[PDB]
Design an enzyme around this catalytic site. Structure first.
Site, short mmCIF file in Angstrom:
data_model
loop_
_atom_site.label_atom_id
_atom_site.label_comp_id
_atom_site.label_asym_id
_atom_site.label_seq_id
_atom_site.Cartn_x
_atom_site.Cartn_y
_atom_site.Cartn_z
N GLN A 105 -19.05 -40.82 31.36
CA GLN A 105 -19.51 -39.51 30.80
C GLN A 105 -18.80 -39.28 29.46
OE1 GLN A 105 -18.46 -35.86 32.93
NE2 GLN A 105 -20.45 -34.96 32.41
N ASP A 108 -20.50 -41.45 26.92
CA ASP A 108 -21.83 -40.86 26.66
C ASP A 108 -21.66 -39.72 25.66
OD1 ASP A 108 -23.88 -38.59 27.32
OD2 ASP A 108 -24.78 -40.38 28.29
N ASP A 110 -19.35 -39.22 23.43
CA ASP A 110 -18.99 -39.73 22.08
C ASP A 110 -20.29 -40.05 21.30
OD1 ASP A 110 -17.89 -41.34 19.88
OD2 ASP A 110 -16.00 -41.37 21.04
N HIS A 351 -25.30 -40.49 36.70
CA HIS A 351 -25.64 -39.35 37.58
C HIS A 351 -25.59 -39.81 39.03
CE1 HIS A 351 -27.48 -37.03 34.04
NE2 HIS A 351 -26.13 -37.00 34.07
#
Ligand code: HEM
Ligand SMILES: *[C@@H]1O[C@H](CO)[C@@H](O)[C@H](O)[C@H]1NC(C)=O
Ligand SMILES: *[C@@H]1O[C@H](CO)[C@@H](O)[C@H](O)[C@H]1NC(C)=O
Ligand SMILES: *[C@@H]1O[C@H](CO)[C@@H](O)[C@H](O)[C@H]1NC(C)=O
Ligand SMILES: [Ca+2]
Length: 595
Positions: A105, A108, A110, A351
């Site tokens: 996460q 992601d 960044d 997820h």
């Protein structure tokens, strides 16, 4: 095709050319095309966008408009019938720590952020979207199916606002809508420093020439820093418990407080900056504010790239790592470094890795207090449980000693995310991240599963029997085709995540190809890649080669017992060693002798 280059957000940037530092915006990375990879530009289109009108109207908008002659299924119905499960027993990854999920996460954040069209400050048709569930303009509500329990408790829909797009708001009919990437495409610690001038300066301590990031003045963690509060109201971190009145953290990325373990790794990264700066000032007392900030910022950038490319990507991509991210052969200024629209869905494989609970552990890695283990839905926009319940250390030991969720074809997304997600402004713990993902795929005009299979040189199954053999799952293939009718119509988020994982990996062949390509491009297309000759001296690199998440923890918390390989499933005490046994970051090669 229509316009050679559309651009009416901001035009003005001169490139320094002789700067040894990145810009905050990511402009001037590519010398020939200085906008490439920069924030607040369109996401790249690897394939042409697929809208029901060819331009902007998402598939699913118009009840009588088919995709290839079939109605697209409701996002929430795909969520209910394919993504949900009840039993959390046995769902954990026996060989990935919770840090594996959490680093995903961070990475992601960044690389990509497609903000909802926040244009409209008068805009009180929030009510029309939330209360009345009326589809129109930027309101694209997730309608509940017949038989949805949420129909009995939550009304007819979940509110959903279309993503922001370039050229920009109330659009035209020329070429297809492109959603914005609001952060820098480079793996560059934009989540720590910000992607725009206003924010980057707000985060800095300009009250002393030490090149420090600002820190909380109200709370501390056994002498160790917290990020500043965001003092703008309303605050979702305040909304979730008034009694505590603990606001959200302010960090380089607006989403930092979305969950307590994201806020935790953000706090570790901010601490590291200030740690680095101090040792750089001790080492080079002359160096003014700016040089300290930039040299520390540039070190933090390299740490993120090494942890991500050395530790993280190989245990995501498994057998496909070598086929897509071969060893580095230097900066290629012809590579497109931009994040693709599809990547922003491929990377949401994360997820399915999020478990139902978060644990606080004490120094013996045993439960911390009587409420050690908390349901994840109580930890959305939660900073109070950090400050008013033991700080970073208990949550960091949970990151090391607890496991990621394993992706499972019959247990895809925990109900903590799928039924109990909290969205700022929407008041309830009652949203469905899986349904949002599917609605967002359509919002962004994503080609379907078979277009991406073709893109990646993979078979394009046309029949139930074909989909069964690709998914290696008869029942899942049956449930998907009952909903989608043709594999051509399956949304890329669910189709990609439905595939069984590559040997030694945590994604299937299609996602491995999409993620593989993108990560190749952000490495090869970055002038400031840590391993590019001239970015770092040979000595600086020999020191950087020895960074590790374990060492980050050791230096920035009072956790003294860590594992050697922090992404593996590690159990205390067998897999844990003292910090003294963990290689350090030798900053001696950053010694600058002016004579
Ligand atoms: C990648 C990625 C995205 C897309 C980011 C972008 O480019 O905009 C993403 C998005 C979201 C969203 C927004 C959903 C939407 O409106 O379309 C929310 C609410 C959310 C919440 C949580 N996520 Fe996520 N997420 C992305 C990637 C990842 C990864 C990657 C490995 C993990 C892990 C992760 C986890 C979580 C999380 C954990 C508790 C919450 C809550 N996300 N994400
Ligand atoms: C766990 O995964 C690592 C890669 O992260 C691997 O090299 C090692 O063999 C694995 N051990 C187990 C339990 O398979
Ligand atoms: C800025 O730095 C000084 C210490 O050098 C500290 O006293 C002050 O509180 C800092 N301000 C912020 C907001 O970090
Ligand atoms: C709210 O925060 C207070 C103060 O820390 C805490 O004692 C209380 O249990 C919390 N209640 C909820 C609903 O989170
Ligand atoms: Ca970035």
């Amino acid at each position: 095709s229509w316009e050679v280059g559309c651009g009416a957000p901001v035009p003005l940037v001169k490139c320094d050319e002789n700067s040894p530092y990145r810009t905050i915006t990511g402009d001037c990375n590519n010398r020939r095309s200085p906008a490439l990879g920069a924030a607040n530009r369109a996401l790249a289109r690897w394939l042409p966008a697929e809208y029901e009108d060819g331009l902007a109207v998402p598939f699913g908008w118009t009840q009588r408009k088919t995709r290839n002659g079939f109605r697209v299924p409701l996002a929430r119905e795909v969520s209910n019938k394919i993504v949900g499960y009840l039993d959390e027993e046995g769902v954990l990854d026996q060989n990935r720590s919770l840090l594996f999920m959490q680093w995903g996460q961070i990475v992601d954040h960044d690389l990509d952020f497609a903000p909802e069209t926040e244009l409209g400050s008068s805009e009180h048709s929030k009510v029309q979207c939330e209360e009345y569930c009326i589809q129109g303009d930027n309101c694209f509500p997730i309608m509940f199916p017949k038989n949805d329990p949420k129909l009995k408790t939550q009304g007819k829909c979940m509110p959903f606002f279309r993503a922001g797009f370039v050229c920009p708001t109330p659009p035209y009919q020329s070429l297809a809508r492109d959603q914005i990437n609001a952060v820098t495409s480079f793996l560059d610690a934009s989540l720590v420093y910000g992607s725009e001038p206003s924010l980057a300066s707000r985060l800095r301590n300009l009250s002393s020439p030490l090149g420090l990031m600002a820190v909380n003045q109200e709370a501390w963690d056994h002498g160790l820093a917290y990020p500043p509060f965001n003092n703008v109201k309303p605050s979702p971190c305040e909304f979730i418990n008034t009694t505590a009145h603990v606001p959200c953290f302010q960090a380089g990325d607006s989403r930092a407080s979305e969950q307590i373990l994201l806020a935790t790794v953000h706090t570790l990264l901010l601490r590291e900056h200030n740690r680095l700066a101090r040792e750089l000032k001790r080492l080079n007392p002359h160096w003014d504010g700016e040089m300290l900030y930039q040299e520390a910022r540039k070190i933090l950038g390299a740490f993120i790239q090494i942890i991500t490319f050395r530790d993280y990507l190989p245990i995501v991509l498994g057998s496909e790592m070598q086929k897509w991210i071969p060893p580095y052969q230097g900066y290629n200024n012809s590579v497109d470094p931009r994040i693709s629209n599809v990547f922003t869905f491929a990377f949401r494989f994360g997820h399915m890795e999020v478990p139902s609970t978060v644990s606080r552990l004490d120094e013996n890695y045993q439960p911390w207090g009587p409420e050690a283990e908390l349901p994840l839905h109580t930890l959305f926009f939660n900073t109070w449980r950090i400050i008013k319940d033991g700080g970073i250390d208990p949550l960091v030991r949970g990151l090391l000693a607890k496991k990621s969720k394993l992706m499972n074809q019959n247990k895809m997304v925990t109900s903590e995310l799928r039924n109990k997600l909290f969205q700022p402004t929407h008041k309830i713990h009652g949203f469905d991240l899986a349904a949002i993902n599917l609605q967002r795929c359509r919002d962004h005009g994503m080609p379907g599963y078979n277009s991406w299979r073709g893109f990646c040189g993979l078979s394009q199954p046309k029949t139930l029997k074909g989909l069964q053999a690709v998914l290696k799952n008869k029942i899942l293939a049956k449930k998907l085709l009952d909903l989608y009718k043709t594999p051509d119509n399956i949304d890329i988020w669910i189709g990609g995540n439905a595939e069984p994982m590559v040997e030694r990996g945590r994604v299937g062949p299609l996602l491995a190809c999409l993620l593989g390509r993108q990560f190749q491009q952000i490495r090869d297309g970055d002038r400031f890649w840590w391993e590019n000759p001239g970015v770092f001296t040979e000595k600086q690199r020999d020191s950087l080669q020895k960074v590790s998440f374990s060492r980050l923890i050791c230096d920035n918390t009072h956790v003294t017992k860590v594992p050697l390989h922090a992404f593996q499933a590690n159990n205390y005490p067998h897999d844990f060693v003292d910090c003294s046994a963990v290689d350090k970051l030798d900053l001696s090669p950053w010694a600058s002798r002016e004579n």
